Design a protein around this ligand. Sequence first.
Ligand SMILES: OC[C@H]1O[C@@H](O[C@H]2[C@H](O)[C@@H](O)[C@H](O[C@H]3[C@H](O)[C@@H](O)[C@H](O[C@H]4[C@H](O)[C@@H](O)[C@H](O[C@H]5[C@H](O)[C@@H](O)[C@H](O[C@H]6[C@H](O)[C@@H](O)[C@@H](O)O[C@@H]6CO)O[C@@H]5CO)O[C@@H]4CO)O[C@@H]3CO)O[C@@H]2CO)[C@H](O)[C@@H](O)[C@@H]1O
Length: 141
Amino acid sequence: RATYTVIFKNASGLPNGYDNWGWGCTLSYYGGAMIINPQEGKYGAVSLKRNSGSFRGGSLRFDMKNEGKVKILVRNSEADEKFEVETISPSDEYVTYILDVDFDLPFDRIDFQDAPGNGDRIWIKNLVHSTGSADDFVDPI
Ligand SMILES: OC[C@H]1O[C@@H](O[C@H]2[C@H](O)[C@@H](O)[C@H](O[C@H]3[C@H](O)[C@@H](O)[C@H](O[C@H]4[C@H](O)[C@@H](O)[C@H](O[C@H]5[C@H](O)[C@@H](O)[C@H](O[C@H]6[C@H](O)[C@@H](O)[C@@H](O)O[C@@H]6CO)O[C@@H]5CO)O[C@@H]4CO)O[C@@H]3CO)O[C@@H]2CO)[C@H](O)[C@@H](O)[C@@H]1O
């Protein structure tokens, strides 16, 4: 049976138990979205750092709208190893994504990066991990 971990639903600030180790951007919160404002030329990203513990495999589910391509990554801090999950095409409307994480190590950071590096904004809501697969994801949101 999959275990679901809600990271944030509607965001009014950083999720409880997380820090932001991102770069090249600032975060703001409005309309229930975590909003990433990347700086042109920086290929900026939010990097949500889980302060206690790690996730293992499974899948990540989130709602996103985004002016440019967004690269999703995860990282293992002990090994300082990053793992690219997917790149997501621009959408002016929120879309729900459920993506398998095939990384062989635990992960404690989740990154959303401005892949083109032009400063395109990113809006995120309803970020949830499951220990199970994307195909098997029963959405608690
Ligand atoms: O929370 C409190 C806690 O803090 C701990 O300290 C934190 C600190 O708060 C936090 O700020 C810090 O965050 C770091 C983070 O750990 C790093 O991983 C991250 O590193 C960035 C880096 O800053 C960027 O410069 C770099 O940018 C890359 C870009 O990612 C890449 O895509 C771009 O690729 C180009 C390439 O250059 C070209 O050649 C060509 O190929 O094109 C590609 C594009 O496709 O290149 C850029 C560089 O030019 O990215 C990395 C990430 O990969 O930086 C942030 C800071 O901004 O983290 C520390 C912890 O380590 C305290 O330790 C603790 O005590 C306290 O409680």
